[PDB]
C-alpha cells in the first residue's frame, strides 16, 4: 500500500555476477542495518566464476558495495592415506545468503568435492558448502555436512543408501531465533533431499582451516527413505521455520519439495527431530508447489500462517485451455492441536509465464494496521513481462484477495525482478518496514522504503 515507488535506491554489482540472486537484511552489533547481497557468478582469482558476497551499507543513493571476502582457493589435504579435494569453480557462492545476529551465512550449493585413494575415488560431486562470517570481528568458518570419505565402490555395494554426494547444501537456508542454522540440500540421498542443522556457535567453535573433513557433534541431519514418493522430490528446495505445534520451546521446520510424488509437489512441517507433523500436497503436477514457502501470522491471532508458491500453476480458462501463471496458497493455522486444512485463500497470477509465486516475502505490518502483510513476486509478470511485485495486506480473515500495491520492475527485460525478496526490516529507521528486491539478471538490487499512509 505505502511503499514508495517514486524514489528508489539502487545497488549494483559487476556485470554478469548475478548480483541480487539472493539477499537479506543484516544488523551489526549496534543494530545498524545493512544489506547482504549474493552474486553467485562473480569472478574469482583465476578469472573463473566462483560467486561472491557483498555487504551494502545503507545509503539512500545506493551505489557500489564492498566485498565480504571468503577463501576462493581450491583446497587439498593428504591424510589417512587419502586425498581430500575441494573445487570452487562455478560453486555459486552467494546463491543463498541469510543473516542472524551479527553473523552472515553465504552458501555455494555447487561447490564440488572428491576423495582419492590410490586408484579409487568417492566421485567428484556437488556436496555444496556454506561460509560463515562475523564481519565486525573478521572471524570466518565453514560448514559442509555432506562431505564424506566413502569410496564410490561402497555406495554401489550398498545400493546408494545414505548417499550425500550431491546434497548441494546451502541451496536454501534459514536460521532459528535461537541461532540454529538449517540448510536445505535438495540433492541429498540420491536426489530425495535432506536437511542439515547445527548451531552457528558450534559451527564456529569446531571449525579450523585445512581440515576439510571434521565433525560438528551438535549437528542433526534428516533421513533417507525407501518410499518412491520422495524420489527426485528435491526436499529442501526451499526452507523456513515457525511455531506450528503450540509448544513455544520447540521450533518447527517448513520444507518445500516441489517435485515430490512424481512432480505433484509438497510442503511438509516437521519438528526439530525431522518427524513429520503435516504435509501439504500440490494441486497440479509440474506446478512446482513448494518452490517457495513463507511463514508469518497474517490474521493477527498470534498463530503463524503458511504461504506456498507454485509459480508454474496452470489456470483453467475458456475452451478447455490452460495458462501458466503461477499460484500462491494461504494456510491459516487453527487454534490448538489441529491439522492445517484446505487453503483459506488462493492467489493466482494473470500474466502468461509470469511465475507469480516464485518468491513470497513477509513484510511485517507495512501499513501499521495490526495485521502482517506479504509481497509476492511474478518475476516475468506485468503487461511487459519485465517483472512485478504484488503486495497483499493481512486482515482478520487472512489476506486481502486483491493487491494493495503493485511494483513494476524499473529494470530492463530479463532482469528477473523479484526472484529474491526480503521485507519486515526498517532500514532507514522511519518506523515502517521496508522491502528489498533483487534483479540478478540486471545485477542490481532495489530498495523500496515504506512511508506513512496517504
Amino acid at each position, epitope marked *: 500500500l505505502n511503499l514508495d515507488p517514486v524514489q528508489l535506491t539502487f545497488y549494483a554489482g559487476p556485470n554478469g555476477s548475478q548480483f541480487g540472486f539472493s539477499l537479506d537484511f543484516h544488523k551489526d552489533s549496534h543494530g545498524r542495518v545493512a544489506i547482504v547481497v549474493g552474486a553467485p557468478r562473480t569472478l574469482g582469482p583465476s578469472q573463473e566464476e566462483t560467486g561472491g558476497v557483498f555487504l551494502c551499507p545503507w545509503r539512500a543513493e545506493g551505489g557500489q558495495c564492498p566485498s565480504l571476502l571468503f577463501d576462493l582457493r581450491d583446497e587439498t589435504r593428504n*591424510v*589417512g592415506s587419502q586425498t581430500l579435494q575441494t573445487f570452487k569453480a562455478r560453486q555459486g557462492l552467494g546463491a543463498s545468503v541469510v543473516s542472524w545476529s551479527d553473523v552472515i551465512v553465504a552458501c555455494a550449493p555447487w561447490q564440488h568435492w572428491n576423495v582419492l585413494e590410490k586408484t579409487e575415488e568417492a566421485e567428484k560431486t556437488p556436496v555444496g558448502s556454506c561460509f560463515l562470517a562475523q564481519p565486525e570481528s573478521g572471524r570466518r568458518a565453514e560448514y559442509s555436512p555432506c562431505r564424506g570419505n566413502t569410496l564410490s565402490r561402497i555406495y554401489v555395494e550398498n545400493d546408494f543408501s545414505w548417499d550425500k554426494r550431491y546434497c548441494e547444501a546451502g541451496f536454501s537456508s534459514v536460521v532459528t531465533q535461537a541461532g540454529e542454522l538449517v540448510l536445505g540440500a535438495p540433492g541429498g540421498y540420491y536426489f530425495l533431499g535432506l536437511l542439515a542443522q547445527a548451531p552457528v556457535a558450534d559451527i564456529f567453535s569446531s571449525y579450523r582451516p585445512g581440515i576439510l573433513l571434521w565433525h560438528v557433534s551438535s549437528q542433526s541431519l534428516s533421513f533417507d527413505s525407501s518410499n518412491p514418493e520422495y524420489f527426485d522430490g528435491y526436499w529442501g528446495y526451499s526452507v523456513a521455520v515457525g511455531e506450528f505445534d503450540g509448544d513455544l520451546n520447540t521450533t518447527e521446520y517448513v520444507v518445500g519439495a516441489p517435485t515430490w510424488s512424481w512432480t505433484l509437489g509438497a510442503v511438509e512441517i516437521l519438528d526439530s527431530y525431522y518427524q513429520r507433523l503435516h504435509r501439504l500436497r500440490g494441486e497440479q503436477m509440474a506446478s512446482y508447489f513448494g518452490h517457495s514457502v513463507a511463514v508469518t501470522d497474517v490474521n493477527g491471532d498470534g498463530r503463524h500462517d503458511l504461504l506456498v508458491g507454485a509459480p508454474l500453476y496452470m489456470e483453467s480458462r475458456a475452451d478447455r485451455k490452460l495458462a501458466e501463471v503461477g499460484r500462491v496458497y494461504l494456510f491459516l493455522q487453527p487454534r490448538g492441536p489441529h491439522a492445517l486444512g484446505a487453503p483459506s485463500l488462493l492467489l493466482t497470477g494473470t500474466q502468461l509465464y509470469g511465475r507469480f509465486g516464485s518468491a513470497i516475502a513477509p513484510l511485517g505490518d507495512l501499513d501499521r494496521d495490526g495485521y502482517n502483510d506479504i509481497a509476492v513476486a511474478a518475476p516475468y509478470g506485468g503487461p511487459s513481462g519485465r517483472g512485478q511485485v504484488l503486495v497483499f495486506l493481512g486482515q482478520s480473515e487472512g489476506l486481502r484477495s486483491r493487491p494493495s500495491q503493485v511494483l513494476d520492475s524499473p529494470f530492463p527485460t530479463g532482469s528477473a525482478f523479484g526472484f529474491s525478496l526480503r521485507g519486515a526490516v526498517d532500514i532507514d529507521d522511519n518506523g515502517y518496514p521496508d522491502l528489498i528486491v533483487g534483479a540478478y539478471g540486471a545485477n542490481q538490487v532495489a530498495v523500496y522504503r515504506a512511508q506513512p499512509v496517504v
Partner: antibody
Amino acid sequence: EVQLQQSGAELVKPGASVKLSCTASGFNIKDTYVHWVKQRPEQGLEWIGRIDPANGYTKYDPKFQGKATITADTSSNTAYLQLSSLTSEDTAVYYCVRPLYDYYAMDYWGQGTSVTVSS
Amino acid sequence: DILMTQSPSSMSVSLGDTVSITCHASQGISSNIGWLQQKPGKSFMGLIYYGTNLVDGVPSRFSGSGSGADYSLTISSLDSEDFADYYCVQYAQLPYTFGGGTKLEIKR
C-alpha cells in the same frame, strides 16, 4: 560430555580369546571412527585398527591381521576388540580412541583395559 | 610404515621452565600430527591435533608447531601437573604410528 568407558581387566590363558568393550558415554558411538591402540612398556604404543560404527567397515595394521577383530553394536552404543589365539606378547593395555573434530585425529581416550595372558 | 622418531627420550626440568619436545617423521606428513599426554598410572589426554590446534580444555601454555616432517610440542611455564609422558602420533597414512615417548621429570 564425551566419555569412553571400557571393560574391566581381563585375565586369560594362552590360546584362548577375549573380547573387550568400549561404550560411548554422552554421545552416539556412530558419530566417528573408533580406534584401538595397544600399549606396552618396552614396545610403547601401537595402532591396531579402526571401525566406522555407522557401517561396520574396518581397517587394520597388517601386524594384527588375524588376532585383532573390531566390531560395534550401535544398539548398545558399544565398540569391541576381539583378540584370538592369545599369547604372552598380547599382554598389554588396550585403549579405544576417537577424534574430537578432525575426522582422522586421535583425541579422546578411554581409561584403558589391562590384559594378562598366563598359564 | 612411517617412522616417528621422538626426542628427547626424557628431560629433567623445573617448574616455570619453557621446554620443547620434537618429533621427526620418515617423510612429510603435512601437519597431520597429534600430541598426547599420559599422567603417571592413568590414561591419555589429547593435547594437539593437526599440528597446531588445541584440543578443547587444554591450557594455552601448550602449543604445537612444525611442518613437513619436523614438529614440536612446547610448554611455556611448566605446571606441577605437566610432569608426565608425551607422545606424538601421525595420521598422514595408515597404519597410524606413534613416537617413542618423552618423559618430563623433576630436576634436583
